[PDB]
Amino acid sequence: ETTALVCDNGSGLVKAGFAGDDAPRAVFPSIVGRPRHQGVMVGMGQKDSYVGDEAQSKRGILTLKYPIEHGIITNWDDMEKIWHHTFYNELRVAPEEHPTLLTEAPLNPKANREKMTQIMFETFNVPAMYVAIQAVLSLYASGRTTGIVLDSGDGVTHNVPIYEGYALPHAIMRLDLAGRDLTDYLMKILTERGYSFVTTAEREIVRDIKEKLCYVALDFENEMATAASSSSLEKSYELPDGQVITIGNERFRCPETLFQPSFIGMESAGIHETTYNSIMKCDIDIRKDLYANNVMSGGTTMYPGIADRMQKEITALAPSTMKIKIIAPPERKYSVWIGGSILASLSTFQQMWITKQEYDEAGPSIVHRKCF
Amino acid sequence: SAPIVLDNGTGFVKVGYAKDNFPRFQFPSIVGRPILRAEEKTGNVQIKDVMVGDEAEAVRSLLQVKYPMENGIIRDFEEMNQLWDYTFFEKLKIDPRGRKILLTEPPMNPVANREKMCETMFERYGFGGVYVAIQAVLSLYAQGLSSGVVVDSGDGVTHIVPVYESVVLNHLVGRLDVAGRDATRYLISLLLRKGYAFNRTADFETVREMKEKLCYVSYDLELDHKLSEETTVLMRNYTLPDGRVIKVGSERYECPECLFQPHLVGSEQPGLSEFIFDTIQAADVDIRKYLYRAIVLSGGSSMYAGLPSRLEKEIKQLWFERVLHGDPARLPNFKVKIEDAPRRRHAVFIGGAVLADIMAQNDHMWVSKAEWEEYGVRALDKLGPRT
Amino acid sequence: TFRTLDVDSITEPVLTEQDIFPIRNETAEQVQAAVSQLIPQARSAIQTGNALQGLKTLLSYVPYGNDVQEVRTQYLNAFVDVLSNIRAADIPAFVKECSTEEIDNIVNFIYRGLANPQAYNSSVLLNWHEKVVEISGIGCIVRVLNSRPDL
Amino acid sequence: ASFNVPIIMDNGTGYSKLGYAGNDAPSYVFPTVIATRSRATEDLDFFIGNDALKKASAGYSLDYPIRHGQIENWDHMERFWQQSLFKYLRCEPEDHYFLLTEPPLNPPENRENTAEIMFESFNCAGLYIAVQAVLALAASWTSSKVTDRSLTGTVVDSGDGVTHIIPVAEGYVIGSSIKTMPLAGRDVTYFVQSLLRDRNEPDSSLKTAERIKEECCYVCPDIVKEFSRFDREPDRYLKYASESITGHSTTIDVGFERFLAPEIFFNPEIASSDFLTPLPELVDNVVQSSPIDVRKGLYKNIVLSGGSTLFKNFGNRLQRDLKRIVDERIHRSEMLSGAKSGGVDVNVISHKRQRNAVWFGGSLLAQTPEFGSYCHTKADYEEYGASIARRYQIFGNSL
Ligand SMILES: Nc1ncnc2c1ncn2[C@@H]1O[C@H](COP(=O)(O)OP(=O)(O)OP(=O)(O)O)[C@@H](O)[C@H]1O
Ligand SMILES: Nc1ncnc2c1ncn2[C@@H]1O[C@H](COP(=O)(O)OP(=O)(O)O)[C@@H](O)[C@H]1O
Numbered sequence A: 001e002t003t004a005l006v007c008d009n010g011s012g013l014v015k016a017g018f019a020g021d022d023a024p025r026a027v028f029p030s031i032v033g034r035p036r037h038q039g040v041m042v043g044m045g046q047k048d049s050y051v052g053d054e055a056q057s058k059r060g061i062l063t064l065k066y067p068i069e070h071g072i073i074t075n076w077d078d079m080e081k082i083w084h085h086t087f088y089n090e091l092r093v094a095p096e097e098h099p100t101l102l103t104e105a106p107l108n109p110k111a112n113r114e115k116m117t118q119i120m121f122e123t124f125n126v127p128a129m130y131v132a133i134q135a136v137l138s139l140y141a142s143g144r145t146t147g148i149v150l151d152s153g154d155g156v157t158h159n160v161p162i163y164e165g166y167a168l169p170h171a172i173m174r175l176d177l178a179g180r181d182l183t184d185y186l187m188k189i190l191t192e193r194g195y196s197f198v199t200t201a202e203r204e205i206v207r208d209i210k211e212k213l214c215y216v217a218l219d220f221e222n223e224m225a226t227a228a229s230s231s232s233l234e235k236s237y238e239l240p241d242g243q244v245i246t247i248g249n250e251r252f253r254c255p256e257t258l259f260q261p262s263f264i265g266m267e268s269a270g271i272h273e274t275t276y277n278s279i280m281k282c283d284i285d286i287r288k289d290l291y292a293n294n295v296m297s298g299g300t301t302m303y304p305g306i307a308d309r310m311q312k313e314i315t316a317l318a319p320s321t322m323k324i325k326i327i328a329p330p331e332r333k334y335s336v337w338i339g340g341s342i343l344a345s346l347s348t349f350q351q352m353w354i355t356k357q358e359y360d361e362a363g364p365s366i367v368h369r370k371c372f
Numbered sequence B: 001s002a003p004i005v006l007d008n009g010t011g012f013v014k015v016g017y018a019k020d021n022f023p024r025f026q027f028p029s030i031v032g033r034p035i036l037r038a039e040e041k042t043g044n045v046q047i048k049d050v051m052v053g054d055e056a057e058a059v060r061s062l063l064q065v066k067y068p069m070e071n072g073i074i075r076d077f078e079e080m081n082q083l084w085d086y087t088f089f090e091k092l093k094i095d096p097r098g099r100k101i102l103l104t105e106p107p108m109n110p111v112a113n114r115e116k117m118c119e120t121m122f123e124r125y126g127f128g129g130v131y132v133a134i135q136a137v138l139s140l141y142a143q144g145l146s147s148g149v150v151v152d153s154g155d156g157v158t159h160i161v162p163v164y165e166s167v168v169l170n171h172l173v174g175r176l177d178v179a180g181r182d183a184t185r186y187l188i189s190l191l192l193r194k195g196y197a198f199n200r201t202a203d204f205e206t207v208r209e210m211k212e213k214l215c216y217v218s219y220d221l222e223l224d225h226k227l228s229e230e231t232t233v234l235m236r237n238y239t240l241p242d243g244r245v246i247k248v249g250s251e252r253y254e255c256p257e258c259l260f261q262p263h264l265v266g267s268e269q270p271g272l273s274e275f276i277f278d279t280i281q282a283a284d285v286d287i288r289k290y291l292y293r294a295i296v297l298s299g300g301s302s303m304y305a306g307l308p309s310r311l312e313k314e315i316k317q318l319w320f321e322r323v324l325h326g327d328p329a330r331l332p333n334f335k336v337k338i339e340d341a342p343r344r345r346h347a348v349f350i351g352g353a354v355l356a357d358i359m360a361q362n363d364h365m366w367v368s369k370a371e372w373e374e375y376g377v378r379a380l381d382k383l384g385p386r387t
Numbered sequence C: 001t002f003r004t005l006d007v008d009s010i011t012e013p014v015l016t017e018q019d020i021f022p023i024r025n026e027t028a029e030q031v032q033a034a035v036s037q038l039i040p041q042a043r044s045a046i047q048t049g050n051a052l053q054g055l056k057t058l059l060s061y062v063p064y065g066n067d068v069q070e071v072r073t074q075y076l077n078a079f080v081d082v083l084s085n086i087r088a089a090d091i092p093a094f095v096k097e098c099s100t101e102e103i104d105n106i107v108n109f110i111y112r113g114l115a116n117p118q119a120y121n122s123s124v125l126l127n128w129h130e131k132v133v134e135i136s137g138i139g140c141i142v143r144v145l146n147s148r149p150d151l
Numbered sequence D: 001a002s003f004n005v006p007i008i009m010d011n012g013t014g015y016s017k018l019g020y021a022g023n024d025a026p027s028y029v030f031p032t033v034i035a036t037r038s039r040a041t042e043d044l045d046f047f048i049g050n051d052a053l054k055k056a057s058a059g060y061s062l063d064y065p066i067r068h069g070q071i072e073n074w075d076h077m078e079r080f081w082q083q084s085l086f087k088y089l090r091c092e093p094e095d096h097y098f099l100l101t102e103p104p105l106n107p108p109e110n111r112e113n114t115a116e117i118m119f120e121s122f123n124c125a126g127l128y129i130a131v132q133a134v135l136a137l138a139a140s141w142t143s144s145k146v147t148d149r150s151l152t153g154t155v156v157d158s159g160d161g162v163t164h165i166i167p168v169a170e171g172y173v174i175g176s177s178i179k180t181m182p183l184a185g186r187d188v189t190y191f192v193q194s195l196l197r198d199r200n201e202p203d204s205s206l207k208t209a210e211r212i213k214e215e216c217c218y219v220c221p222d223i224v225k226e227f228s229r230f231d232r233e234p235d236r237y238l239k240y241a242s243e244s245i246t247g248h249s250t251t252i253d254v255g256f257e258r259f260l261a262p263e264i265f266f267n268p269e270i271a272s273s274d275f276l277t278p279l280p281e282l283v284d285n286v287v288q289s290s291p292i293d294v295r296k297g298l299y300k301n302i303v304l305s306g307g308s309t310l311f312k313n314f315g316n317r318l319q320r321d322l323k324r325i326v327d328e329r330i331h332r333s334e335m336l337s338g339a340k341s342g343g344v345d346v347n348v349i350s351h352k353r354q355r356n357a358v359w360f361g362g363s364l365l366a367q368t369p370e371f372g373s374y375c376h377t378k379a380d381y382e383e384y385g386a387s388i389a390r391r392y393q394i395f396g397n398s399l
């Protein structure tokens, strides 16, 4: 075997690269852009649909729409188009040679996994492949075996507690609040300042704004009171047009939804309370240890200052006799990819691949008898 | 005596009192400055410094018209101050200090606009009460219904709000940035197709009246393309108030098509029916019938001929295509009923008039002058903590 | 996409032609036998130079229906032959000596005969139409416009 | 197999520029006018172009088939096409592919008539219709070897009958931002003729006005300062030699027209009341109505086109006005917010093929192998009927 491939088909971005490395070979938004103008420019070979970074470059005229909704793929055609683009542009290796690795959200409707493995075996001829939950990869990223992973990304967020050796499936919690919902709420509250964003390209612009100028408040009412004098919370942004945008308390109001889901009218408990309930569902033999290790991973958890509030609030909920630490790796965005690469690099993993030889006589349902 | 109610819409201004049924006075929200161009300019009576309202729209030939409100918000405020002065001082000619006024405002406006409008209403007039309400709840009041989703389409902006059993779902309020003004602009472009040019200011109101009288919403796209492609029956003759006649063809059914296909006016947002379907589908599974069972049209822009039928057919079709995935077995098990009351144009005013005496006789429900001056702009929170 | 795939055709079943006109109480075999009995009498009357009586006898009963296409075609062929085998000079007396319903059937069937000229003789049908419209009036054509589609 | 070279038609309001694909210049650039009477039958006694111009008082009455870019009379247009093809261009229609051009915002009926005339009266192998602009964007880039195509900018096509401001972003043309002013070289020519009229010059022929523009007119910053400068400076008072027909040395004393004429573009109120928005302001509105992400590309590259943009200091004045307006808006936003910005630059671009940029772009486009697949084949016309080209595509979305 030459090499191995890891492709974390996230809701918003795709991080595809060879195994055995810490730097992804190609990371780019998972957007398929189709122009909305019949006025074709004759010549110079413009193609019907645009994917990857070209979509971001030409978003001025296309209609960007993600092919994943809350971790569930719903436009398999554009999914396979994205995979085609990856394999034969950003990797330049045929899938017939190098086996791949995929990532799936926990508690995902398994029709998604079945169709995924079926379509890969059909139209990509991969020698072998595997599907693993992002939580185990996140745990493997730090090299340890204890803790509960707070993996929040673009589509959904989930917590999977795990001790040495075996996990605890009954304690897995999943919430749909994620970066897409944060961007939507930020767009909703931006119109209160007179700035209106409606198009999908405007959604990307607001997402960039959220990337650059957002943070989590240590104490919500204290910062709201501080917002009485617009001194420090007030910042500025430069639009691609050349405009100037003035942003106020919306800098920290939109990340608060992770802890107060009622802001966007979703009946639920904030991620801190979700983690507390998930750990409480575990037995006394295990939470005494799981309190100390709390793995934070994903693009959404990259917010500056979110870790401090997470820590303070989790110790507020937990008994005062507990010592709680929050793990804050400086490479949390690619943490799932690094965990997958580490898992693939181990020589003790070649045994439980999913080869075509066993797939042919077992059908697409084999993905359930092998992975989990 | 009775509290006053004001509905300062983008394209029109309506005003009245409680217990009223029809708007006491309606007039375009226009401000006319004097101007001399290549016309005959007969000296009918006189041209004053600033002419607004009915006199402005009548003498519009000799004056230029500027719209203070655009996209549901006030662009230039001095002209709008002149508008309130006109309305209070000659339209009703009753300007006491201390009376109660109930204002209106589309849902997702900027905070500054509402705040400084309330500040102007307090300081410059001295009224003893104020209340600003969404047009959607007033439209709901108009028919007396309690549960159901109401859509309001006006001159400035079209918005929809779902309400279930006296509870407003503030997180699912709609805002579609296509309205009658965009339709009028598209009509002007579609007339520029043939050769007619309307670059003056009075021509804007002329083509607005043209779209009022002639334009209609299609019910079947392919059928109307066939009609306009093979038959000349769709041709209408319209004579301008200047006295000149023009020919209008496919423009009749292509003007209000921008509401259902906003890509015609270069809008990425989904059409009216698609946006309604998404708004209803995003709600909880329990209230979905009552969202579908009671859809109430409101506003002037909803008065398009053949609009309710197209909306009902399109929402049923889109439900069939999106949920059933082409299976026609469960189609007859769907109940959708679009309300088409004759006065859905003044539903906002009717709801405001009802709310005027619904919550009267108790000043401790809204904001007073003293409370305003001693709690600043932040005092304007008793109205509603909407998102 | 969703603009096409019309649904109005199924949710509200539109009125269909049997809801407008009375249904045919007679059976297919009965009417087929009746026509197969009437036609040879008309042919024999044509043979013996009494075409007026043959047309009168053939005019007494008239078939209709969406399941009687073939027998209706044979009836129409016989009617066309009978009418074409009539001297022109005797037409006005025949037309004046008929009831309104009989004239309605005559004009209906001659007008249907006009619809297929690749197998019929149009001149005699046009001449008969001219004379009947001249004598009886326009009400016959009105009744044609308001007759059953299967007629 | 190896097809014949495509033919690049062009039917402007004032001038028609025929030619071939791959050529370095149009074969014929002659006025779009046909001479006609009112033992050769009256069916054939017609002349076009320069022959028509010379044969004006010999018994013919000239008429312009195209006005404001839209064709009104069809006999003149079809006779013009047949005379061109079978007299000057010298091609057999059945063994060539044509690339017709016509201004946007035209009725679909005009396109249908053009297609049916071409495929019935002549019945060429294939007909392709392009928008006067586009070709302008194609011809904008000079050293077009493999890669250096702008593919994003604004084309200000001002010609004889009508001017068009069309933005293009990544090739595709944004319809919703298309706006057109119904003033061009012909209207300002009528203005120049009226200015000659009021001064009671010995000769006031329209050709004299055209030549007065050809070697006299230039753009000025502002009108009152230019009037003051003309009053002070006495060497700006030229006397153009006319020699109309027999008036030898009848010099025409030109005057303030030299700067009053080009100012109509930047001040359209003078021409008529049908339009009142100055050209830089209208361009600003066009760019602002465009999607936000492509505004930088629209402002960065502005391409002039047509023969009416050859005025001296036209591009300089247009760039100055646009830059001033965009600076005003940006500074207003800055003092509203209280932060600096890098700003946006504006580069109005003029090139060596200003006069016939449309033709040059068409010739460069036709040489691409993929162009043949885009043409309307004759089989498609005979199958789908004469309405094969009625769905207007560039501006607006059908249905
Ligand atoms: N029968 C009709 N056909 C077509 N259009 C109509 C008809 N009646 C009214 N309209 C349109 O409705 C508009 C008037 O709406 P109205 O002024 O009530 O809304 P508004 O109160 O300004 O909205 P908002 O409250 O959002 O500002 C007019 O511009 C007119 O074009
Ligand atoms: N520096 C950052 N600060 C805040 N949020 C970020 C940052 N970078 C990315 N995000 C958010 O994270 C999301 C991407 O998450 P991602 O790791 O792609 O999850 P998935 O792989 O499941 O799609 C984006 O939608 C973005 O909103």
Ligand SMILES: Nc1ncnc2c1ncn2[C@@H]1O[C@H](COP(=O)(O)OP(=O)(O)O)[C@@H](O)[C@H]1O
Binding pocket: D011, D012, D013, D014, D015, D016, D158, D159, D160, D161, D162, D185, D186, D213, D214, D306, D307, D308, D309, D310, D311, D355
């Ligand atoms: N040097 C010039 N300066 C200004 N205007 C000119 C000049 N040469 C020609 N014009 C005018 O500008 C028009 C534009 O030229 P052209 O593009 O060939 O015409 P059309 O717009 O009819 O296709 C000419 O018809 C003429 O009226």
Ligand SMILES: [Mg+2]
Binding pocket: A008, A009, A010, A011, A103, A134, A153, A336
């Ligand atoms: Mg992930």
Ligand SMILES: [Mg+2]
Binding pocket: B009, B135, B154, B299, B348
């Ligand atoms: Mg209203």
Ligand SMILES: [Mg+2]
Binding pocket: D012, D013, D132, D158, D159, D160, D161, D162, D306
């Ligand atoms: Mg031109």
